[PDB]
Amino acid sequence: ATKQAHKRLTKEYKLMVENPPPYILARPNEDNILEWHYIITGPADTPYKGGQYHGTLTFPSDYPYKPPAIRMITPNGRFKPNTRLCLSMSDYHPDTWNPGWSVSTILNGLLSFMTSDEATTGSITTSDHQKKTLARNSISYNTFQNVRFKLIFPEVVQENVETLEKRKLDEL
Ligand SMILES: [Cl-]
Ligand SMILES: [Cl-]
Numbered sequence: 550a551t552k553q554a555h556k557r558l559t560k561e562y563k564l565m566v567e568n569p570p571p572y573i574l575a576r577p578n579e580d581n582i583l584e585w586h587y588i589i590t591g592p593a594d595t596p597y598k599g600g601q602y603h604g605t606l607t608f609p610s611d612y613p614y615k616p617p618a619i620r621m622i623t624p625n626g627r628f629k630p631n632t633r634l635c636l637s638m639s640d641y642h643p644d645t646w647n648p649g650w651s652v653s654t655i656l657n658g659l660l661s662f663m664t665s666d667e668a669t670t671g672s673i674t675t676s677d678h679q680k681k682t683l684a685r686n687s688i689s690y691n692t693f694q695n696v697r698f699k700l701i702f703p704e705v706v707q708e709n710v711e712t713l714e715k716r717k718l719d720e721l
């Protein structure tokens with residue numbers, strides 16, 4: 550990464566440790582500071598309640614002067630997986646990019662957009678039932694079918710194992 554980008558993104562992670570944004574866990578790949586991974590916890594008064602949504606922010610080589618590419622990995626019913634999402638703070642809008650936006654601000658914009666129904670490149674149309682099904686299955690998806698989640702968030706995989714144990718044992 551450039552030295553400027555590396556310093557900036559290191560500080561952004563520190564700021565998130567100090568004041569963790571509601572609903573959002575995020576950190577750099579330990580092998581590439583430009584590639585960040587996040588986990589959004591679905592807010593309760595949405596069809597995403599109980600869901601666990603992993604995705605990435607990929608900062609470009611010219612960060613902080615160009616925006617990240619924003620993708621969601623976990624199937625979710627709102628955004629097509631593994632696809633760059635057209636958000637106000639994203640690489641679709643380099644024209645109105647503000648270098649000063651924090652990573653928390655960018656991620657909060659993703660979450661705020663996600664819980665609206667506004668259409669944009671990368672969004673998809675599903676029913677409420679489909680979103681709820683995907684939310685319910687998201688923890689399993691991340692625990693068993695998501696290679697990158699296991700590599701980046703192994704401590705969360707272990708938490709997930711307990712969560713799924715309790716769901717299975719307490720309901721059967
Ligand atoms: Cl390029
Ligand atoms: Cl535009």
Ligand SMILES: [Cl-]
Nearest residue numbers: 642643644645
């Ligand atoms: Cl714009």
Ligand code: NA
Nearest residue numbers: 579700701703
């Ligand atoms: Na590690």
Ligand code: NA
Nearest residue numbers: 578579580581
């Ligand atoms: Na490594």
